[PDB]
């Protein structure tokens, strides 16, 4: 029926063997015969819900329902590029004698994530090489490598022969500027991981330097981005057009991810039903089989996103999404101010 | 020369997995079990450890010392 | 104050102020390397 | 490499430059992007008038 | 007076690949200054220059 | 990690589009080392470079 | 300094104007276009990035009747702001509800 085809066309991204169909968003006023797709704030506030399905340290998965791609992709892009963090930009090097080149060492120290909460610091102004309490942190790395005064006669392995032959990010000591030592309790300003190798030494070699962490967004440089990866996927709804029984139920449960099709016994007979279509990765193995291409409709619900935000440790991911939403609110607020300034 | 701090493709911190990865391979895990135990789900992170060459462990012999 | 050069083979300070032929004080090695500068150099972490 | 081919019929000229080429479809077909480092060197004598 | 100004947007500038088999291997383009080091042009003009 | 697709039109003839975040993290980071050498000689006359 | 500049189409009395949103990219462009297209008095709306080197987007709006295009644009900004306000309140409720449930279990 024409009406049934229209409903699929405006509500399901369907996956073919050779290409995806119904990709674009179409629910705009005048695109359809009887539908009234004009903006209605009450219809939005009714349908929209958020379900947090998993959360722990550094990871978060949640569902947004009823929002469009043009806004969910804005949240994805803010988290990558426009949420600010604190990262090293200047390294002042005194007596680097390691094999690691100074330009390579400075690049590595930039990429270490710093646990400093970026809301408490301002942007450093143009120029201003020193900076101040308001807008910079400071770290001091200083490692000297020496021989171990006692060692077994075989003397084979580095971890016995030498001490400080590996530099680790735990050697970074925070150096407070101004009243920062009272505002932050001890241990708050630290590198996150406590195990990142930077250099690697041999006795007589020395590293002494001084870092300056400032605030910046991820559009500038990629060491400022707070997310491991931030992405989304539309939710699958794999549907069975004809009942698949017998020993075709087993081979239908192996053309998918290992937890979505269940085979159940109803009369001592195996019938297959979809159980958890969320766990499907869409490897499209139902189209290699020749008998079962015509019993499934691999699809995607358009207005149901499954966000996955993995943080790098600067601030937890529930605060990251809240900060990201405020940035888009801030972008809209700025141009409203300039329409008021002109008119 | 030395293990990169972040994965090029996504920015996960893989630079602290290296000293663990060599340790697990002494306990005779396979490479595909060792990377799964460290949390490298995506293959862009997996190739950081799988394709790395530890050159600095060998350049540091020639390097001068007391 | 006197210039100090670092021996290539044994990493020993030689202090070759005088216009003598280049030669290590402790060993026969004849190649010398200058020490690193005292002055600070600032690098952008990029 | 003699006079008539090397120095008379063709010859080295100044106000000239050379660089690697790379695509840019957002330029019109009559345009070419010139880098600032070449533009600061390659000067044109503009005669002063009203 | 003569001011030797820098090359600016709208200068007529000659542009040429090194082996020239026909007249279209050297053509004149309007310059536009851009930050990156390469010369850049729309790929529709790749066929004359080869 | 290569995606084989047509993106942005800046890749018409063998040109390839790179990722900014990959380059920042260290993809394709390289070092160029160059020499400079000087010789101070003692002449036939008892005089020397200094 | 100014982030917005308005460039009217040559023949048209203010119903066609191009908005040069400075210091912007696809992040605001595609989201704001969506809210403007939901207005039934808009005929054409779309954005282009002038050049990858340049942080500008030329948002074009053309309206059907006599109404000036400044009004769809302003309504577009306000409704997008109200959406992002409502998204935030729902999100923060669900995080607190999830944390309260997880703390109430196994205790
Ligand atoms: Zn990765
Ligand atoms: Zn010696």
XYZ file of C-alpha atoms and ligand atoms in Angstrom:
714
model
C 0.000 0.000 0.000
C 1.090 3.563 -0.778
C 0.452 4.727 2.809
C 2.520 1.884 4.282
C 5.373 2.760 1.916
C 5.197 6.450 2.928
C 5.396 5.517 6.626
C 8.507 3.400 6.067
C 9.937 6.204 3.907
C 9.621 8.783 6.707
C 10.477 6.573 9.691
C 12.929 3.779 8.764
C 16.408 3.738 7.265
C 16.331 0.393 5.416
C 19.469 -1.574 4.538
C 19.647 -3.324 1.183
C 22.224 -5.735 -0.148
C 23.770 -3.053 -2.360
C 22.858 0.225 -0.711
C 21.075 1.872 2.155
C 17.757 3.529 1.338
C 15.643 6.305 2.899
C 18.809 8.009 4.203
C 17.618 11.646 4.125
C 15.346 13.363 6.645
C 11.990 14.288 5.131
C 9.519 15.412 7.844
C 9.330 19.043 6.707
C 6.129 21.065 6.039
C 4.736 20.427 2.584
C 6.720 17.282 1.817
C 3.702 15.031 2.416
C 0.023 14.937 1.486
C -1.853 15.012 4.775
C 0.883 15.197 7.381
C 1.430 18.481 9.244
C 5.188 18.538 9.819
C 5.437 22.171 10.950
C 7.282 22.859 14.192
C 5.318 22.115 17.360
C 7.234 22.493 20.636
C 4.657 20.473 22.596
C 4.895 17.475 20.249
C 8.684 17.573 20.661
C 8.559 17.797 24.476
C 6.083 14.909 24.613
C 7.978 12.401 22.451
C 11.527 13.205 23.630
C 13.049 10.933 26.278
C 16.556 9.997 27.428
C 17.455 6.526 28.721
C 20.877 5.968 30.284
C 21.603 2.289 29.665
C 25.208 2.017 30.924
C 27.631 4.224 32.845
C 30.876 3.674 34.754
C 34.268 5.350 35.041
C 35.238 6.999 31.738
C 32.352 5.487 29.734
C 28.687 6.239 29.112
C 26.007 4.900 26.780
C 22.597 6.545 26.517
C 19.620 6.709 24.167
C 18.072 9.882 22.753
C 14.621 9.374 21.222
C 12.755 11.932 19.130
C 15.682 14.207 18.262
C 16.837 14.610 14.649
C 20.228 13.840 13.061
C 20.892 17.546 12.461
C 20.982 18.112 16.254
C 22.448 14.807 17.473
C 25.345 15.360 15.075
C 25.834 18.799 16.619
C 26.323 17.185 20.041
C 28.816 14.726 18.501
C 30.788 17.584 16.925
C 30.886 19.774 20.066
C 32.288 16.911 22.173
C 35.040 16.316 19.621
C 36.009 19.892 18.831
C 34.438 22.573 21.033
C 34.449 21.370 24.666
C 37.657 22.785 26.227
C 40.300 21.041 28.353
C 43.699 21.785 29.897
C 46.771 20.610 27.978
C 50.483 21.456 27.795
C 51.469 24.072 25.225
C 54.901 25.275 26.342
C 57.879 23.231 27.484
C 60.936 25.021 28.881
C 63.834 22.599 28.624
C 66.908 22.657 30.861
C 69.610 20.023 30.086
C 67.773 17.397 28.039
C 70.405 14.714 27.405
C 68.140 11.792 26.469
C 68.010 10.147 23.050
C 64.431 11.428 22.630
C 64.494 14.613 20.543
C 63.225 17.752 22.267
C 60.569 18.408 19.616
C 59.369 14.809 19.975
C 59.398 14.991 23.787
C 57.387 18.221 23.714
C 54.844 16.612 21.370
C 54.446 13.627 23.712
C 54.010 15.780 26.824
C 51.296 17.725 25.003
C 49.133 14.648 24.552
C 49.081 13.659 28.256
C 45.604 14.490 29.630
C 45.593 16.713 32.740
C 42.942 16.175 35.446
C 42.377 19.949 35.926
C 38.736 20.993 35.713
C 38.697 23.454 32.775
C 35.752 25.513 34.042
C 37.886 27.092 36.784
C 40.419 28.598 34.329
C 40.176 31.349 31.739
C 41.648 31.499 28.259
C 45.129 32.953 28.155
C 45.147 36.170 26.131
C 47.003 36.747 22.870
C 50.704 37.058 23.556
C 51.184 36.805 27.351
C 53.988 34.251 27.481
C 54.088 34.102 31.290
C 50.436 33.753 32.285
C 49.070 33.778 35.812
C 47.082 31.930 38.499
C 43.833 32.542 36.609
C 44.782 30.827 33.365
C 47.758 28.454 33.619
C 49.001 25.453 35.516
C 52.606 24.374 35.763
C 54.323 20.980 36.011
C 57.989 20.116 36.597
C 59.531 16.925 35.201
C 63.021 16.161 36.520
C 64.633 12.707 36.245
C 68.285 11.660 36.571
C 69.256 8.100 35.665
C 71.979 6.325 37.651
C 73.394 2.845 38.124
C 72.132 0.617 40.908
C 74.922 0.318 43.543
C 74.180 -3.411 43.972
C 73.400 -5.943 41.249
C 73.736 -9.663 40.636
C 76.738 -10.886 38.649
C 74.629 -11.948 35.642
C 73.495 -8.263 35.405
C 71.299 -9.028 32.399
C 68.107 -7.010 32.843
C 67.627 -3.217 32.942
C 65.160 -3.238 35.870
C 67.978 -4.445 38.167
C 70.978 -2.619 36.659
C 69.470 0.855 36.585
C 67.156 3.146 38.510
C 64.932 5.743 36.780
C 65.736 4.161 33.410
C 62.048 4.606 32.527
C 60.380 7.984 32.776
C 56.699 7.765 33.661
C 54.108 10.507 33.922
C 54.082 10.076 37.744
C 57.375 12.000 37.804
C 55.394 15.153 36.886
C 55.162 17.341 40.010
C 52.583 20.130 40.110
C 54.056 23.562 40.884
C 51.374 25.913 42.291
C 51.160 29.513 41.101
C 49.625 32.023 43.515
C 46.774 30.877 45.757
C 46.187 27.677 43.692
C 47.652 25.572 46.530
C 44.623 26.403 48.717
C 41.913 26.265 46.033
C 42.907 22.719 45.005
C 43.374 19.919 47.561
C 46.489 17.784 47.101
C 46.220 15.260 44.292
C 43.499 17.060 42.324
C 45.984 18.555 39.838
C 47.702 15.454 38.472
C 48.140 13.598 35.212
C 45.274 11.140 34.873
C 46.838 7.826 33.888
C 49.914 7.516 36.213
C 51.589 5.026 33.828
C 52.341 6.751 30.481
C 55.897 6.247 29.280
C 57.436 9.455 27.970
C 61.144 8.799 27.540
C 63.489 5.952 28.411
C 66.941 6.484 29.858
C 70.414 5.067 30.491
C 72.813 6.160 33.253
C 74.288 9.618 33.026
C 71.315 10.911 31.030
C 69.025 13.577 32.423
C 65.713 15.307 31.717
C 64.654 18.557 33.395
C 61.818 20.662 32.054
C 58.845 22.834 32.906
C 55.372 22.620 31.386
C 52.632 25.250 31.040
C 49.100 23.867 30.754
C 46.516 26.261 29.319
C 42.910 26.037 28.138
C 41.889 25.342 24.560
C 39.244 23.715 22.424
C 39.690 20.675 20.198
C 39.097 22.544 16.946
C 42.494 24.163 17.536
C 44.557 21.055 18.284
C 43.587 17.451 18.887
C 45.267 17.211 22.311
C 42.422 19.286 23.724
C 39.606 16.888 22.880
C 38.111 15.274 26.004
C 36.654 12.151 24.348
C 38.213 8.811 23.436
C 35.553 8.566 20.832
C 32.095 10.083 20.724
C 29.656 8.621 18.234
C 26.129 7.375 17.789
C 24.207 4.791 15.889
C 20.563 4.503 14.994
C 18.789 1.619 16.607
C 18.158 -1.574 14.631
C 14.745 -3.158 14.276
C 15.281 -6.423 12.422
C 11.852 -7.847 11.637
C 10.835 -11.296 10.405
C 8.421 -11.148 7.481
C 7.619 -14.882 7.517
C 7.937 -17.314 10.446
C 11.294 -19.087 10.305
C 11.032 -22.569 11.821
C 12.916 -25.833 11.568
C 16.659 -25.945 11.003
C 16.481 -22.626 9.166
C 16.024 -21.054 12.608
C 19.543 -22.124 13.600
C 21.189 -20.691 10.486
C 19.203 -17.479 10.964
C 20.622 -17.179 14.487
C 24.183 -17.459 13.132
C 23.737 -14.752 10.466
C 23.651 -12.157 13.252
C 25.429 -11.016 16.389
C 25.638 -13.656 19.169
C 22.730 -12.406 21.273
C 19.903 -11.056 19.096
C 18.099 -14.077 17.600
C 16.846 -16.611 20.116
C 15.550 -20.036 19.106
C 12.822 -21.270 21.432
C 10.914 -24.541 21.753
C 7.138 -24.102 21.627
C 5.993 -27.713 20.975
C 9.341 -29.448 20.836
C 9.907 -27.389 17.681
C 12.380 -24.569 17.102
C 10.941 -21.182 16.133
C 13.020 -18.001 15.926
C 12.147 -14.533 17.185
C 14.092 -11.308 17.540
C 15.049 -10.741 21.164
C 17.546 -7.879 21.538
C 18.138 -6.082 18.221
C 20.251 -3.414 19.953
C 23.292 -5.726 19.993
C 23.405 -6.122 16.201
C 26.351 -4.739 14.251
C 24.785 -5.291 10.783
C 27.360 -7.522 9.146
C 24.662 -8.279 6.513
C 25.193 -12.047 6.574
C 21.548 -12.725 5.802
C 22.242 -11.850 2.155
C 24.944 -14.477 1.638
C 22.283 -17.077 2.386
C 20.007 -17.599 -0.607
C 16.809 -18.851 1.050
C 16.586 -16.230 3.822
C 17.107 -12.921 1.992
C 13.336 -12.624 1.603
C 12.197 -13.102 5.222
C 14.034 -10.217 6.933
C 13.872 -6.428 6.710
C 17.103 -5.018 8.115
C 16.316 -1.455 9.101
C 17.153 1.408 11.441
C 14.824 3.542 13.529
C 15.567 7.101 12.483
C 14.719 9.099 15.610
C 16.352 6.711 18.122
C 20.070 7.282 18.685
C 22.415 5.294 20.920
C 25.187 7.669 21.969
C 28.510 6.255 23.156
C 30.757 8.799 24.901
C 34.079 7.495 26.216
C 36.033 10.128 28.124
C 39.797 10.346 28.467
C 39.713 11.196 32.184
C 39.629 15.012 32.390
C 36.030 15.174 33.618
C 33.395 12.396 33.642
C 31.210 11.927 30.556
C 27.872 12.947 32.082
C 29.384 16.394 32.652
C 30.809 16.334 29.083
C 27.388 16.003 27.462
C 25.972 18.706 29.751
C 28.859 21.000 28.800
C 28.371 20.176 25.108
C 24.668 21.061 25.105
C 25.440 24.424 26.753
C 27.923 25.262 23.976
C 25.236 24.979 21.286
C 22.962 27.043 23.534
C 25.808 29.552 23.754
C 26.254 29.700 19.974
C 22.564 30.524 19.526
C 22.702 33.112 22.315
C 25.571 34.995 20.639
C 23.800 35.632 17.330
C 20.606 36.684 19.113
C 22.730 39.389 20.746
C 23.910 40.619 17.348
C 20.409 40.757 15.892
C 19.625 42.982 18.875
C 22.754 45.080 18.304
C 21.935 45.775 14.649
C 18.206 46.321 15.179
C 61.171 4.689 18.202
C 58.966 4.663 21.298
C 55.252 3.798 21.725
C 52.962 6.712 20.791
C 50.924 8.168 23.629
C 47.623 8.273 21.719
C 46.081 6.221 18.934
C 46.224 8.183 15.669
C 42.668 7.357 14.634
C 40.656 8.013 17.794
C 42.914 9.279 20.562
C 42.573 6.497 23.104
C 45.602 6.460 25.413
C 47.461 3.368 24.187
C 50.816 4.702 25.392
C 50.516 3.044 28.797
C 49.516 -0.417 27.535
C 52.973 -1.262 26.165
C 54.760 -2.379 29.332
C 51.688 -4.484 30.165
C 51.416 -6.020 26.661
C 54.994 -7.369 26.738
C 54.329 -8.760 30.214
C 51.225 -10.716 29.180
C 53.156 -12.199 26.237
C 55.562 -13.699 28.777
C 52.558 -15.483 30.315
C 52.001 -16.977 26.799
C 48.806 -15.237 25.874
C 48.238 -14.910 22.177
C 48.304 -11.414 20.701
C 44.550 -11.448 20.163
C 43.921 -12.440 23.769
C 46.422 -9.903 25.110
C 44.856 -6.920 23.332
C 41.362 -7.997 24.427
C 42.551 -8.080 28.049
C 43.797 -4.482 27.837
C 40.541 -3.087 26.437
C 41.468 -2.417 22.804
C 38.100 -3.125 21.180
C 38.561 -1.147 17.958
C 41.197 -2.330 15.520
C 42.733 1.131 15.105
C 43.969 0.887 18.708
C 44.984 -2.761 18.278
C 47.474 -1.970 15.504
C 49.322 0.490 17.772
C 50.641 -2.352 19.893
C 50.535 -5.055 17.221
C 52.608 -3.177 14.623
C 54.967 -1.282 16.971
C 58.726 -1.812 16.850
C 60.592 -1.049 20.084
C 63.544 0.733 18.498
C 64.521 2.798 21.555
C 65.337 -0.410 23.488
C 68.035 -1.017 20.823
C 69.176 2.539 19.997
C 69.954 2.966 23.724
C 72.811 0.458 23.556
C 74.800 2.557 21.117
C 73.852 5.737 23.046
C 76.730 7.088 25.167
C 76.938 6.425 28.884
C 79.323 6.829 31.834
C 85.027 29.020 32.464
C 87.371 26.709 30.406
C 85.651 24.887 27.559
C 84.905 21.238 28.317
C 84.543 18.681 25.540
C 83.071 15.222 26.057
C 84.949 12.184 24.739
C 83.117 10.006 22.244
C 84.279 6.582 23.423
C 84.269 6.938 27.222
C 82.152 10.084 28.040
C 84.980 11.782 29.996
C 85.466 15.534 30.393
C 88.754 16.636 28.815
C 88.945 20.493 29.099
C 90.856 21.183 25.891
C 91.667 24.865 26.429
C 95.235 24.644 25.107
C 95.980 24.413 21.366
C 97.065 20.792 21.609
C 96.114 18.108 19.061
C 92.714 16.597 19.857
C 93.175 13.493 22.027
C 91.368 12.075 25.034
C 93.078 12.459 28.387
C 92.254 8.967 29.684
C 92.042 6.908 26.454
C 93.392 7.112 22.946
C 90.123 8.256 21.317
C 90.471 11.281 19.038
C 86.848 12.474 18.571
C 85.281 15.094 20.862
C 81.686 16.250 21.334
C 80.509 19.611 22.680
C 78.254 19.691 25.746
C 74.659 20.919 25.732
C 73.907 24.629 26.177
C 73.053 26.035 29.588
C 70.461 28.480 28.189
C 66.806 27.465 28.117
C 64.964 26.774 24.856
C 61.146 26.867 24.727
C 59.237 24.401 22.523
C 55.584 24.484 21.542
C 53.890 21.232 22.548
C 52.325 20.679 19.157
C 74.356 24.692 -24.156
C 75.728 27.212 -26.674
C 74.744 30.825 -27.298
C 71.978 30.384 -29.855
C 69.933 27.761 -28.004
C 71.091 28.199 -24.407
C 71.340 31.980 -24.073
C 69.666 33.647 -27.092
C 66.520 31.753 -28.138
C 65.709 30.845 -24.550
C 67.099 32.136 -21.319
C 66.630 32.226 -17.572
C 64.191 34.911 -16.457
C 63.493 36.538 -13.129
C 60.102 37.213 -11.528
C 59.506 33.482 -11.744
C 58.617 30.736 -9.284
C 58.060 27.009 -8.937
C 56.181 24.815 -6.434
C 54.273 21.540 -6.110
C 50.685 21.712 -7.420
C 47.601 20.444 -5.563
C 43.857 20.645 -6.320
C 41.322 23.272 -5.236
C 37.821 23.028 -6.790
C 36.513 26.125 -4.995
C 38.539 28.368 -7.293
C 37.168 29.464 -10.632
C 38.745 28.028 -13.772
C 40.482 31.350 -14.522
C 42.111 31.556 -11.058
C 45.246 30.146 -9.416
C 46.122 30.152 -5.725
C 49.552 31.682 -5.059
C 51.160 31.163 -1.630
C 52.011 34.196 0.500
C 55.729 33.277 0.471
C 55.809 33.649 -3.330
C 53.545 36.705 -3.329
C 55.798 38.632 -0.932
C 58.726 38.049 -3.313
C 57.162 38.436 -6.777
C 56.599 42.190 -7.081
C 54.920 44.228 -9.823
C 55.978 47.842 -10.533
C 52.819 49.927 -10.139
C 53.237 53.437 -11.541
C 51.768 56.086 -9.246
C 48.880 58.060 -10.758
C 45.622 59.782 -9.732
C 57.000 57.292 -8.864
C 57.122 53.502 -9.064
C 55.981 51.387 -6.114
C 57.040 47.742 -6.331
C 54.012 46.307 -4.579
C 53.536 42.658 -3.696
C 51.486 40.374 -5.889
C 47.832 40.845 -4.936
C 44.468 39.388 -5.922
C 43.647 40.024 -9.570
C 47.190 40.061 -10.952
C 47.554 38.420 -14.352
C 50.066 35.617 -13.835
C 51.453 33.043 -16.291
C 51.310 29.388 -15.294
C 53.144 26.586 -17.067
C 53.945 22.863 -16.876
C 57.534 22.093 -17.888
C 57.017 20.013 -21.088
C 54.987 22.012 -23.568
C 53.571 20.257 -26.598
C 50.994 22.877 -27.607
C 50.083 26.473 -26.830
C 47.540 25.610 -24.081
C 50.427 24.328 -21.909
C 51.016 27.973 -20.875
C 48.002 30.098 -19.919
C 47.338 33.233 -17.892
C 45.435 33.115 -14.614
C 44.196 35.674 -12.126
C 46.162 35.263 -8.902
C 44.528 34.868 -5.503
C 46.696 34.718 -2.379
C 46.134 31.842 0.040
C 48.187 30.607 3.006
C 49.366 27.105 2.015
C 52.564 26.603 0.034
C 51.284 24.816 -3.097
C 49.959 26.285 -6.334
C 46.290 25.392 -6.690
C 43.814 25.408 -9.566
C 40.458 23.884 -10.467
C 40.823 20.328 -11.795
C 38.894 21.147 -14.997
C 42.165 22.768 -16.172
C 44.203 19.576 -15.585
C 43.620 18.292 -19.129
C 45.387 21.230 -20.923
C 48.430 21.047 -18.668
C 48.509 17.202 -18.546
C 42.899 3.484 8.443
C 41.777 4.106 4.857
C 38.203 4.704 3.768
C 38.054 4.283 -0.014
C 35.473 6.916 -0.961
C 35.004 10.192 -2.838
C 35.175 13.060 -0.374
C 35.188 16.863 -0.800
C 36.341 16.994 -4.423
C 39.919 17.882 -3.392
C 40.984 14.339 -4.339
C 40.309 14.248 -8.085
C 43.690 13.132 -9.455
C 45.666 10.975 -6.966
C 45.292 13.612 -4.214
C 44.413 12.182 -0.817
C 42.533 13.776 2.075
C 44.179 13.453 5.491
C 42.727 13.831 8.985
C 43.818 16.789 11.119
C 43.492 14.900 14.395
C 45.672 12.039 13.138
C 48.428 14.448 12.103
C 48.294 16.147 15.502
C 48.685 12.806 17.269
C 51.766 11.953 15.212
C 50.825 10.329 11.905
C 53.502 11.168 9.360
C 55.683 13.060 11.832
C 59.222 13.087 10.480
C 62.676 14.449 11.209
C 65.097 15.958 8.691
C 68.779 15.910 9.620
C 71.281 18.050 7.729
C 75.036 18.490 7.968
C 77.338 21.451 8.232
C 81.096 20.994 8.276
C 84.116 23.271 8.545
C 87.837 22.594 8.161
C 90.585 24.657 9.809
C 93.931 24.032 8.142
C 97.595 24.703 8.884
C 99.312 26.175 5.845
C 102.809 25.730 4.417
C 103.775 29.008 6.019
C 103.451 28.701 9.809
C 99.994 30.268 9.947
C 96.587 28.838 10.702
C 92.863 29.359 10.460
C 91.284 30.319 13.756
C 34.914 42.034 15.495
C 31.276 41.490 14.401
C 30.199 37.876 13.874
C 27.158 38.459 11.632
C 26.809 40.352 8.357
C 23.738 40.535 6.118
C 23.995 40.584 2.324
C 20.702 41.154 0.520
C 20.061 39.707 -2.921
C 20.300 42.400 -5.571
C 16.722 42.468 -6.867
C 14.808 41.508 -3.737
C 13.355 43.763 -1.036
C 14.666 41.977 2.075
C 12.894 38.652 1.505
C 16.192 37.173 0.228
C 19.341 37.713 2.283
C 22.556 35.762 2.896
C 23.730 35.589 6.519
C 27.523 35.351 6.885
C 27.863 33.619 10.253
C 31.516 34.230 11.143
C 33.656 31.849 13.231
C 31.308 28.958 12.442
C 31.167 25.660 10.574
C 28.686 22.826 9.933
C 27.872 22.559 13.679
C 25.533 25.541 13.807
C 24.768 25.550 10.077
C 23.005 22.203 9.752
C 21.234 22.517 13.113
C 19.943 26.032 12.428
C 18.905 25.112 8.863
C 16.770 22.312 10.315
C 14.804 24.660 12.573
C 14.341 27.241 9.783
C 13.091 24.583 7.333
C 10.436 23.584 9.904
C 8.874 27.044 9.432
C 6.145 26.954 6.729
C 6.913 30.529 5.588
C 10.415 29.630 4.343
C 10.853 28.661 0.672
C 14.616 28.024 0.384
C 17.208 27.552 3.101
C 20.731 26.216 2.926
C 24.319 26.909 3.857
C 27.731 26.617 2.236
C 31.228 26.915 3.625
C 32.951 29.540 1.467
C 36.371 27.854 1.732
C 37.910 25.307 4.147
C 40.518 27.933 5.079
C 37.742 30.381 6.033
C 35.532 29.986 9.104
C 32.428 31.416 7.431
C 29.083 29.962 6.413
C 26.738 31.725 3.974
C 23.270 30.847 5.273
C 20.729 31.796 2.583
C 17.051 32.250 3.500
C 14.225 33.090 1.089
C 10.655 33.586 2.265
C 7.384 33.116 0.413
C 5.225 36.107 1.192
C 6.189 39.650 2.074
C 7.801 38.889 5.447
C 11.499 39.735 5.855
C 13.926 36.857 6.274
C 15.244 38.247 9.607
C 12.102 36.897 11.299
C 12.574 33.188 10.270
C 16.249 33.458 11.264
C 15.450 34.868 14.710
C 12.688 32.291 15.286
C 15.171 29.640 14.141
C 17.748 30.643 16.760
C 15.192 30.828 19.599
C 13.579 27.447 18.930
C 16.974 25.726 18.669
C 17.896 27.291 22.012
C 14.666 26.036 23.602
C 15.323 22.541 22.199
C 18.821 22.506 23.706
C 17.399 23.785 26.993
C 14.858 20.958 27.093
C 17.438 18.330 26.028
C 19.626 19.343 28.986
C 16.872 19.131 31.622
C 15.863 15.654 30.435
C 19.475 14.431 30.296
C 20.366 15.636 33.801
C 17.208 14.051 35.210
C 18.101 10.669 33.697
C 21.684 10.737 34.999
C 20.489 11.486 38.548
C 17.764 8.835 38.258
C 20.308 6.264 37.036
C 22.773 7.083 39.830
C 20.029 6.943 42.477
C 18.814 3.536 41.253
C 22.347 2.098 41.132
C 23.076 3.403 44.637
C 19.757 2.031 45.923
C 20.598 -1.447 44.654
C 23.147 -3.683 46.437
C 22.718 -1.663 49.649
Zn 41.963 3.908 18.107
Zn 88.454 8.667 25.670
